[PDB]
Amino acid sequence: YEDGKQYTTLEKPVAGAPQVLEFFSFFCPHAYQFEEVLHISDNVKKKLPEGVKMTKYHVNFMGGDLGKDLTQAWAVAMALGVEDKVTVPLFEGVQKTQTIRSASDIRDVFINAGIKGEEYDAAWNSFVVKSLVAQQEKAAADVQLRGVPAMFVNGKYQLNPQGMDTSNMDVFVQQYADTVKYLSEK
Ligand SMILES: CCCCCCCCCCCC
């Protein structure tokens, strides 16, 4: 494992932080890059068993006001538990068909995903969401988020991809996957 290589350790723990935290933006990386980060993100879970939950927050430091809307829209997603239904259409919407330009178009993605309009409007104006939006930004600050994608464990560690199983990707994934495990059981 040797810290400094695959996982760094923060000069200062974050207390009260999720067992596993991922940070992402609907604005970067682009295309296949976003879709493979997604795969990796997914496998870390088919291997992080027994009570260890994964959390994923959006970061607004990319996108401006459409970015602050997306961070709010992601809070609605987590509230409604529709993360796996709106991720790709949101991703493809903002980036691929470049159709999402306003907070309204975001709404169109949820509705076109099966979520009722009033359910969505009720969450977007709901409190739970306002508290998730603040909860997301805090986390970004607490770890002094620099950029994405990023993953932290127990609030102690910052996973570290680029000093690890280079070539391939499957080989990459099992290590990024194996690393997160330890830190949990650590
Ligand atoms: C779960 C997403 C983890 C993100 C780290 C993936 C980005 C590093 C992979 C790109 C370098 C091979």
Structure tokens given for 23: 């940070």
CA dihedral sign of residues 108, 130, 81, 182: positive
Helices 32-45, 170-185: inter-axial angle, 10-degree rounding: 40
Q: How many residues does the chain have?
A: 186
Among 70, 130, 66, 56, CA closest to 101: 66
Nearest CA to ligand 1 atom 6: 37
Q: At residue 50, what is the residue type?
A: E
CA dihedral sign of residues 89, 79, 158, 144: positive
Task: Give me the resolution in angstroms, 1 decimal.
Answer: 2.6
**Mutation test of ligand 1: which of 176, 181, 183 has the most ligand atoms closer than 8 Å to its C-beta?**
176
Technique used by the depositors:
X-ray
184 lines ligand 1 (CB under 6 A): no
Alpha-carbon gap, residue 88 to 91, rounded angstroms: 5
- Give CA 173 to chain center in angstroms: 17
Closest atom of ligand 1 relative to the 41 alpha carbon: 1
Q: What is the DSSP letter of 11?
A: S
172 lines ligand 1 (CB under 6 A): yes
Domains of the chain: 1-186 (3.40.30.10)
Among 135, 167, 163, CA closest to 58: 135
28 lines ligand 1 (CB under 6 A): no
Which residues, in sequence order, are CB contacts of 76 under 8 Å at separation 6+? 110, 120, 123, 124, 129
40 lines ligand 1 (CB under 6 A): yes
- Between the CA of 139 and the centroid of ligand 1 the distance, in Å, is 19
State the DSSP string of 142-180: HTT--SSSEEEETTTEEE-TTSS--SSSHHHHHHHHHHH
